[PDB]
Design a protein around this ligand. Structure first.
Ligand code: NH4
Ligand code: NH4
Ligand code: NH4
Lengths: 28, 386
């Protein structure tokens, strides 16, 4: 899993939310 | 370009380090100097990533991900995609030593869970105790797997580094006290980073926006210490297509992405039909108009503290769609089927309320209140929590 295994479980949840929130489209 | 978009770290001693911020460098470092340093890259909130992590933090576009099925060429193409972002970013920053340092230490064998054995997951300092790490890199210093606990970056962009130890000048003292003595010494615009087991140096305010008291938890832990809350307002960023609900703390959003189109719409009073605000008692979410109505004083305080305009509380349409249970998990609330099996009277669990007729009121109330008032859960809620 070499792309993610240098990260802490918490660092990955932080990143997941940052990415979610950076790319989330406004409603219609 | 930010003047502090990277920091170059060097070893100068047993457990001793020095950093220089990009704007303070007295010379143009050679590719060797770049490749021999621990290079720290500033992200969008002022966290600093060492190279193997900065590289993997490049995310793949939605479209590219979808178009890609394969596999292993999967890894190849992801790498080639991130390699071009990485290369182009290094060119713009003026960095000529662009090694990633993702290479693992091949003398080290993993346990069956494909993780480090407990005997392989510590670095020993001479004077300061051991520190746990996530991964064993062939180039440990350059990979970021050898830095101190604390990085202070003054308003002049000067770097000071620090280690905690059991019984140091701050033993059983709170992060906020350290913080106040730092800004007294250096200026109130001083940044403090606290190291993650991965090597990431997270900004202290980023950590607090994620969970209040996180900065302090991380600070204590460096010294071997241990010490003992719904978000104030939330916005639904899910319900799409219609997709699952996903409520993100407003404070998180406004602090950390002040130019997001969500943030900017919220600041103007839009998207109020996706906003939930916490009751004075801490146990219930409701619309902003409901809270304005039912407790005008708390409404005005909550909305000023969180940075929302009070106009949201005079809005209303002409609630059955919403998830039956939401669960707090960081600065966001998630539907139960969105949580991983390991994540799941929990005080993290909120129930979509129903009135005496059996109908959804639109509010969510903590399970602990259901127990205290001896109120039975609605059956939709009850089966999700089975
Ligand atoms: N990742
Ligand atoms: N890594
Ligand atoms: N990684």
């Amino acid at each position: 899993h070499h792309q993610s295994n240098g990260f802490t479980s918490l660092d990955l949840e932080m990143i997941e939310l940052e990415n979610f929130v950076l790319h989330c489209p406004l409603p219609e | 370009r930010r003047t502090d978009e990277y920091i170059l770290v060097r070893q100068t001693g047993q457990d001793k380090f020095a950093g220089t911020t990009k704007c303070n460098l007295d010379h143009l470092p050679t590719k060797a100097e770049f490749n021999a340093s621990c290079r720290l890259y500033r992200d969008g909130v002022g966290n600093y990533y060492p190279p193997p992590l900065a590289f993997e933090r490049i995310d793949l576009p939605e479209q590219l991900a979808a178009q890609l099925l394969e596999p292993r060429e999967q890894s190849k193409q992801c790498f080639q995609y991130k390699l071009e972002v990485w290369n182009r970013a290094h060119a713009e920053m003026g960095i000529t030593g662009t090694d990633i340092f993702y290479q693992t230490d091949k003398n080290i064998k993993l346990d069956r869970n494909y993780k480090l054995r407990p005997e392989d997951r510590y670095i020993q300092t001479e004077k300061y105790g051991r520190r746990e790490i996530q991964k064993r890199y062939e180039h440990q210093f350059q990979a970021g797997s050898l830095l101190p606990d604390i990085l202070i970056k003054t308003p002049q962009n000067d770097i000071h580094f620090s280690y905690r130890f059991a019984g140091d000048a701050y033993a059983n003292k709170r992060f906020e006290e350290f913080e106040r003595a730092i800004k007294t010494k250096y200026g109130s615009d001083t940044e403090i980073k606290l190291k993650s087991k991965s090597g990431i140096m997270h900004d202290s305010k980023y950590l607090e926006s994620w969970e209040r008291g996180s900065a302090d938890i991380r600070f204590a832990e460096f010294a071997g210490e241990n010490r003992a809350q719904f978000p104030a307002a939330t916005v639904n960023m899910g319900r799409q297509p219609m997709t699952r609900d996903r409520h993100v703390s407003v404070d998180y959003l406004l602090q950390n992405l002040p130019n997001s189109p969500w943030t900017q719409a919220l600041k103007e009073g839009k998207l109020w039909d996706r906003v939930q605000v916490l009751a004075r008692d801490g146990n219930r979410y409701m619309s902003p108009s409901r809270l304005e109505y039912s407790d005008p004083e708390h409404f005005t305080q909550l909305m000023d503290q969180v940075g929302l305009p009070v106009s949201m509380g005079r809005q209303s349409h002409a609630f059955d769609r919403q998830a039956a249970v939401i669960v707090a998990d960081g600065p966001n609330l998630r539907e139960v089927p969105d949580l991983s099996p390991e994540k799941l009277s929990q005080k993290d669990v909120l129930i979509a309320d129903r009135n005496e007729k059996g109908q959804r009121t639109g509010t969510y109330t903590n399970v602990v209140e259901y127990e205290r008032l001896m109120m039975k859960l609605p059956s939709d809620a009850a089966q999700l929590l089975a």
